[PDB]
Amino acid sequence: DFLTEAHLDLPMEFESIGKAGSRLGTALAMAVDHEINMVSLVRNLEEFFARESCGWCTPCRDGLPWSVKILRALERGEGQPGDIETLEQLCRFLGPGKTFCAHAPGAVEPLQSAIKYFREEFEAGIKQPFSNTHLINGIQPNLL
Amino acid sequence: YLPPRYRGRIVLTRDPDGEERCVACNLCAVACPVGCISLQKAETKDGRWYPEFFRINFSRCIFCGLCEEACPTTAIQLTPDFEMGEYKRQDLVYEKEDLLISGPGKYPEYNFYRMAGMAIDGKDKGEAENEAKPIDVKSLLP
Amino acid sequence: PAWQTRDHLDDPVIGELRNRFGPDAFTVQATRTGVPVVWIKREQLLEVGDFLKKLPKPYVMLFDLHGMDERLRTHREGLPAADFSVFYHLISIDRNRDIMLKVALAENDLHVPTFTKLFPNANWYERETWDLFGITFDGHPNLRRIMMPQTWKGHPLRKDYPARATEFSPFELTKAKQDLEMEALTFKPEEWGMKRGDFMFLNLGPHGAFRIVLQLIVDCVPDIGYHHRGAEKMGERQSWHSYIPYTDRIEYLGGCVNEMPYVLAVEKLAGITVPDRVNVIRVMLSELFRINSHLLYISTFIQDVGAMTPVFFAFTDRQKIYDLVEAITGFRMHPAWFRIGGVAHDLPRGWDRLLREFLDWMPKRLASYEKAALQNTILKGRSQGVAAYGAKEALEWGTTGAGLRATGIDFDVRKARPYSGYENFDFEIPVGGGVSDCYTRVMLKVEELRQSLRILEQCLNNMPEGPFKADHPLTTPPPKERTLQHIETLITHFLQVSWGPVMPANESFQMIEATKGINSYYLTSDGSTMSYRTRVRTPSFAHLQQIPAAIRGSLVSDLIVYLGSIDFVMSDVDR
Amino acid sequence: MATIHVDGKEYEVNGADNLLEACLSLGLDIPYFCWHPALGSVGACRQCAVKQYQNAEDTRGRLVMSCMTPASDGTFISIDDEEAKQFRESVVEWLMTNHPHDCPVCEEGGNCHLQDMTVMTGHSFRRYRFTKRTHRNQDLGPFISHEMNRCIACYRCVRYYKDYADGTDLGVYGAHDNVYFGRPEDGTLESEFSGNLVEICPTGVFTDKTHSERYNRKWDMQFAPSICQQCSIGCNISPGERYGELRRIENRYNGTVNHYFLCDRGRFGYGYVNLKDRPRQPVQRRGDDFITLNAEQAMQGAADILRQSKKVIGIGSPRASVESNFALRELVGEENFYTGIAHGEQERLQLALKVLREGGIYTPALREIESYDAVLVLGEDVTQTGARVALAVRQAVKGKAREMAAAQKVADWQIAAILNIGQRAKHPLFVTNVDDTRLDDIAAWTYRAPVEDQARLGFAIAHALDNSAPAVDGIEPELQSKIDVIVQALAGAKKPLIISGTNAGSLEVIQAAANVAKALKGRGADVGITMIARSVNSMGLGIMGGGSLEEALTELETGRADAVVVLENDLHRHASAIRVNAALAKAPLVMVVDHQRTAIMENAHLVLSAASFAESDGTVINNEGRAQRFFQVYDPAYYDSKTVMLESWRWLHSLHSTLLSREVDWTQLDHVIDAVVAKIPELAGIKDAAPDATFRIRGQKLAREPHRYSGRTAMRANISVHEPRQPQDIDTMFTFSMEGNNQPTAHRSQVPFAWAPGWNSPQAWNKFQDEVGGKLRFGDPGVRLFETSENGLDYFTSVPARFQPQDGKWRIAPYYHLFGSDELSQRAPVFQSRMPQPYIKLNPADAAKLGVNAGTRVSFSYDGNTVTLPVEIAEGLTAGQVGLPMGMSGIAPVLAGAHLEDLKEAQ
Ligand code: SF4
Ligand code: SF4
Ligand code: SF4
Ligand code: SF4
Ligand code: SF4
Ligand code: SF4
Ligand code: FES
Ligand SMILES: [Ca+2]
């Protein structure tokens, strides 16, 4: 999970990074500066995680490509208003014990932290309304 | 004067490309409460499902329109025409040549095969709506 | 929600039953009927029944009495061990509450004591239960077959009895010649009713066709069952969705009024609360059909006892109502437009101008009807005191509708137990001065027709926005535009129209105010895609049962006038 | 054993089971894809998710998978928990993102497990707006079509094909969301059990190609409980009919015999019913002209000539029912009744019967085979004849890995852990044949030898197990070493299985297998023995008895038999064609009662239009000795009114009454079965195989059609718009309609088809079982005619001499094929391409002496005839032998063990 400048001055132990909302991992840290768009950074991360799925279990094999396609829409500015709430649901349902191994829980850990700390750049992607259906002549639709 | 939604004579319609719209899925036959539809699926060398025969017993039909609303291709529709009458009850049994009309009827633009994943002539894999190109397992890209 | 499963233990009728018979003398069933359901033993049936008749706010009316087979019912958790059952639906007007009593039976001993002494309307109901099932009601005076002919072997609502005509041998006319010879030799063996008796026994056959054997009036005996279509049996051989056309043909004038109790009952088994636009659309179609039926009753009433020359203009007005119905639904009669969860389509875009043209057109005609009927003297003189009854006679024979309202009992279903969003409308309930006769009933209908037009005025000006179908997985069928493009919607539509929607195992019950009286649907689900038991309570059955009690002491002309005044149709009576 | 708490309620369940198979047995609906009762739990699809609490007071727990979670004592789970329900809906939503819009044109529609689970979760609204992934398809042969777009990646196909069925040519390819299930390249699926993939796959990826030619939905089918007629195993089947033609073959669950799986010959070999060449009316010859008769005319015409005859003989068939052979036996008398099989085939069948009835060794059912610890297969090429036994033997060989895992406290359902512990360790399996078999990949040792050499190894194993058994002198040290390997595995086994059969064509191999079983029985082992017979009612016709076909042909050509009534028999398979056609020309009256068009009906004087198994009722007795009833699927007179197809027992009983008293008697089925029980005590069990036609489920008759059956007023409306009466069944408890009972909890054993509310797929069989993967709820249909005898037999001392080649004479080594060797199923058009080209197999040294190579057409002489075949080369075939394909068009199965006098290159 991503951490902020406020999360420095904090020791590099397993339970100290654990109480800060993240995991200590390999202990090799990566710095993100002010010129990297967070949505593009997460989209690069999820693209790696989606394509490195072994394909055994459904919420990794099929859940993660949906997250990638939403982030590509957010990065280009084609995001729809239900998209961010889908990313939240994906993170909840790809947690520990719901998938077959720990690959998928590790994949959603950057995604859920970046929405929590940087929601404004994710909200900036939403510039188009919701439409996943096309009109059919002679059939009046069900108007919500 | 008849309204557009009038429930008279039952026809089978055609695609805008000119093929028959019925894919012989048998949903209209099972959804009919009177059991007045019999049909059998046939398949072209192209791979397109179509009805070998389509038979409606209009002596039994009550014109409820449950067949039209069951159809997932808009092939079967009810038209504003009540002009029917016969000397023999056997002549109330209509075959596919008495039912298949020259155009699309009430829904001018819907084509089911454009939606469907199944491959027929003119639509190979990835040529349907919201469908990507097939990627082989041997592809170099991960 | 208004559909969740309830045991109704907080109803005050159960506590006084506990304090009278003990806690071990009955058993409470949790249903979705909206009423308490209690299983009693047949040795206590009469004691429990006469106890509810002298409660301090007593249950005065036996709504329905019929049976269930129950042998093939797999989901029977909590019920006592039954091979057959008989249910008794009772109604208290002063509490605005109902109770249902269920008596369990074994397959060898189909015997229960008759309920006729307490409630007189039970006589025809027990004969039908004897006809369609094989339950014998001990103490019944003339327990003969009321639906099928007297040589018919077999009880057609038993689950071992085959439903379809194709399963039997066809009309080879071996039995047609014998029935023709029997009908030709129409003689009285003094078995067709009480038949105590010098006396001229005459059969007279006349909006429906039925026979009656009259003593020349010393004794009259209706013979019904000539219009039995097996609608109740048909519910067992049709899915929940494909049964919907059969609902429209219980009453021909009813149309979408007839579909309303069935879809509301199925929606209780499904657990569906519909949107507001569905409520206003369903109320709109039901008040249009109610206006059409009331104009038919007023029209035909003026023609038989009066000059029919001015009132023939009402045909043009009924043509306008049929053109508006087939503009909305598609077809003039038997629309089959109500769906589980909604309606079949949305309203077409030019509906408002046609309805506004009908609402502008109607008051001039309506005020001409009021002038033609309220102020007339000849028909009023031929309709006052002609086979009258009061409040005590209405509640005994289960008479509802304009009859019951013509007495002082203000009981509508749209106000007492609101359904389909009727409680968000401004309308009044007309009521008589305590005497129900031929003049009072017609005057009440003219007042009801004006209130129905008020409901249609609020529907055009307060038509809300949104869907015509609920968003729920048991909404059958799904919206078609989503079905034509989306696979999960296509999958739901595929299984719903073919195998059927799966209703979980429960019992639901809805009552509506019909065009004539109160029509209800009591549906039982065994967890399958078809109904296990479908019960249709029609008010015309009770109204036609009431006529020998009131016509006794009158002429044949009074019989014809009384039959023309009562709200009875034989499709309702025989189903 | 264990008590678990589900959704507040409390239940009693088996502790060894996992939570999915515990809760499905109680009637709690949990959705699932990747789990199968036969295959075990792997945990892939994540659809079976439930919320598990630590105790009764824990309010916030965790989501587990019920297929992967043991049902321990003290378990607290909630299926209807809101977080569990949302997740289960999401799993369906994730599978729906890439699924094609194909349900109207998908053959799985209405019978699709994915359709049922999508509705059951309650996911009906699409949110995904992006593109769908697509796949190209493969050609998988004439039986199975391929549509990879519909795949949900549940991995059931590969787990069935590689792990369970031990096929080698199906795998998973790719990675992430691009996983592809199929073959490495296009071509026919090589496994004999490939066709179970249509039931195993929960979607429409693998579908029946033979059914998609004449497709109809499941609700329009008419079903009956039937038995497979293609070999002797007796697999229970549910054939479906629409518009008067048999449409598909479905597996009918029977927990004692076949359970979830059929072989490919059973599943796809049904096409002979649908032939246009079958006789539909009785036909009487007049010189060259042919006259069509009705049922009354045929009986009066036949019995006039039969009254004038001085002796009438009857020829039965192994592929005819017990009621049909007995009625034939009742018409000519038991002194004049012949079985219709050759004398040598008759001698092997009654010896096979003798060891089952009098050997004192229990004969296991087809599912009981999977519990045995050692298997010796002597002579029976069991994959090609009796294919479901080979599937059952593969599961028995995997019992070693189950024993190791049980010692390490791994649960029985955790299949990937058990397979990892195993690591190619197998229970020992020793097979003997004339060439290589399809069991060679799992066999501890294969022995390719002539049939006398296979018997001589069998007698030597018995002598090395017991001193009292007769010995085989002349065994070389190389073979002697291997005999010690087999004997130490057999004697060290706790439960050995001995398999042989009549298809090897040797009396001595069957004698050697009873000696091995006797020697193991004396040691204290719980030994079972299994014999495979040739046809569906081979064991039933052997219990009835009669003289051989050769004796019948003698009585014809020596003038004593004036007439002959052949019943469902093509005599060319069992005896020489030239002898049969000569002896049927001397007879004044030849009568044939067959449902198939055969060569002997050209010169026949009267042909009666017999019914096939789809149009008939009757009892067949399988290789185990179990009597099983098969019911009629459809009335053939309903659609075509000129069709006079009656049962063979109904034609022969009526003919006997017209012969006696000039009045036809169309009898009922229970009267014929009652007649069998009185006259033949050995067939007394057939009365209890099924109930009679007065059996009712609370007054209801058992339904053949699903309750949503369609087209009642339009099916026959092109002939007459007036609806005909529904066909009436007086023979059985079933009705030719949908107005009847098919409840899962109905007290019956004969289930025509499985359907439940919310379960339209083959997964609806879970509602009909007591525990899932167990037995049917009220017992599996079928009864064993004989129990194990108190005392056994003596040792057979008839040891054959060692095989020696001869110059000129060539021994015929039998080769069998699943798609060619059976009489009815080789006439199916879909089997014409699946069967191989006719060949002749030679040793390389013998083809070098003959001067030929692979592909050379060679000519030989059998019985004065000449057949030319192309040569194939067989290294495992020993010299002096000649491989022929048995049961083809031209090569009769009586040729096994025969000799070819002349062999030379064709010119
Ligand atoms: S979560 Fe693990 S097991 Fe599941 S698909 Fe991803 S990598 Fe494979
Ligand atoms: S008309 Fe429509 S529902 Fe009927 S078979 Fe054709 S496509 Fe299917
Ligand atoms: S309109 Fe109704 S009765 Fe007529 S064919 Fe269609 S479903 Fe059957
Ligand atoms: S596999 Fe099932 S869900 Fe998919 S298209 Fe076929 S029937 Fe529909
Ligand atoms: S092909 Fe069928 S069985 Fe195999 S993984 Fe795909 S859906 Fe499952
Ligand atoms: S093993 Fe024999 S009985 Fe079973 S399906 Fe195969 S051919 Fe039929
Ligand atoms: S069925 Fe349990 S995870 Fe697939
Ligand atoms: Ca029969």
Swiss-Prot record, chain A:
Source organism superkingdom: Bacteria
Annotated positions binding [4Fe-4S] cluster: 54, 57, 60, 101
Membrane-spanning parts: none
Subunit structure, as described in the record: Composed of 13 different subunits. Subunits NuoCD, E, F, and G constitute the peripheral sector of the complex.
Family assignment from sequence similarity: Belongs to the complex I 51 kDa subunit family.
Role played: NDH-1 shuttles electrons from NADH, via FMN and iron-sulfur (Fe-S) centers, to quinones in the respiratory chain. The immediate electron acceptor for the enzyme in this species is believed to be ubiquinone. Couples the redox reaction to proton translocation (for every two electrons transferred, four hydrogen ions are translocated across the cytoplasmic membrane), and thus conserves the redox energy in a proton gradient.
Protein name, per record: NADH-quinone oxidoreductase subunit F
Protein species of origin: Escherichia coli (strain K12)
Residues of the full protein shown: 298 to 441 of 445
Curated annotation (Swiss-Prot), chain B:
UniProt gene name: nuoI
Reaction catalyzed: a quinone + NADH + 5 H(+)(in) = a quinol + NAD(+) + 4 H(+)(out)
Protein name stated in the entry: NADH-quinone oxidoreductase subunit I
Protein's job: NDH-1 shuttles electrons from NADH, via FMN and iron-sulfur (Fe-S) centers, to quinones in the respiratory chain. The immediate electron acceptor for the enzyme in this species is believed to be ubiquinone. Couples the redox reaction to proton translocation (for every two electrons transferred, four hydrogen ions are translocated across the cytoplasmic membrane), and thus conserves the redox energy in a proton gradient.
Keywords assigned by UniProt, alphabetized: 4Fe-4S, Cell inner membrane, Cell membrane, Iron, Iron-sulfur, Membrane, Metal-binding, NAD, Quinone, Repeat, Translocase, Ubiquinone
Keyword flag Nucleotidyltransferase: no
Cofactor(s) listed in the protein's UniProt record: [4Fe-4S] cluster
Source organism: Escherichia coli (strain K12)
Binding note for cofactor: Binds 2 [4Fe-4S] clusters per subunit.
GO BP terms, alphabetized: aerobic respiration; respiratory electron transport chain
Similarity section: Belongs to the complex I 23 kDa subunit family.
Swiss-Prot record, chain C:
Enzyme class, UniProt record, top EC level: translocase
Residue ranges, annotated region (NADH dehydrogenase I subunit C): 1-178
E.C. number: 7.1.1.-
Keywords: Cell inner membrane, Cell membrane, Cytoplasm, Membrane, Multifunctional enzyme, NAD, Quinone, Translocase, Transport, Ubiquinone
GO molecular-function term, one example from the UniProt record: NADH dehydrogenase (ubiquinone) activity
InterPro entries (alphabetical): NADH_DH_suC, NADH_DH_suCD, NADH_Q_OxRdtase_suD, NADH_quin_OxRdtase_su_C/D-like, NADH_UbQ_OxRdtase_30kDa_su, NADH_UbQ_OxRdtase_49kDa_CS, NADH_UbQ_OxRdtase_CS, NDH1_su_D/H
Primary location recorded for the protein, binned into one broad class: cytoplasm
Subcellular location: Cytoplasm; Cell inner membrane
Region (NADH dehydrogenase I subunit D): 198-575
Domain of life: Bacteria
A cellular component term, taken from the record's GO annotations: NADH dehydrogenase complex
A GO BP annotation: respiratory electron transport chain
Catalysed reactions listed for this entry: a quinone + NADH + 5 H(+)(in) = a quinol + NAD(+) + 4 H(+)(out)
Classification via Pfam families: Complex1_30kDa, Complex1_49kDa
Membrane topology: Peripheral membrane protein
Entries under Gene3D superfamilies matching the protein: Cytochrome-c3 Hydrogenase, chain B, NADH:ubiquinone oxidoreductase, 30kDa subunit
Family: In the N-terminal section; belongs to the complex I 30 kDa subunit family. In the C-terminal section; belongs to the complex I 49 kDa subunit family.
Function: NDH-1 shuttles electrons from NADH, via FMN and iron-sulfur (Fe-S) centers, to quinones in the respiratory chain. The immediate electron acceptor for the enzyme in this species is believed to be ubiquinone. Couples the redox reaction to proton translocation (for every two electrons transferred, four hydrogen ions are translocated across the cytoplasmic membrane), and thus conserves the redox energy in a proton gradient.
Swiss-Prot record, chain D:
Record-linked PROSITE patterns: 2FE2S_FER_2, 4FE4S_HC3, 4FE4S_MOW_BIS_MGD, COMPLEX1_75K_1, COMPLEX1_75K_2, COMPLEX1_75K_3
Binding-site residues for [4Fe-4S] cluster 2, renumbered to this chain: 151, 154, 157, 201
Gene Ontology molecular function, alphabetical: 2 iron, 2 sulfur cluster binding; 4 iron, 4 sulfur cluster binding; metal ion binding; molybdopterin cofactor binding; NADH dehydrogenase (ubiquinone) activity; quinone binding
Compartment(s): Cytoplasm; Cell inner membrane
GO cellular component, one term: respiratory chain complex I
Binding partners and assembly: Composed of 13 different subunits. Subunits NuoCD, E, F, and G constitute the peripheral sector of the complex.
Family indicated by similarity: Belongs to the complex I 75 kDa subunit family.
Record protein name field: NADH-quinone oxidoreductase subunit G
Gene: nuoG
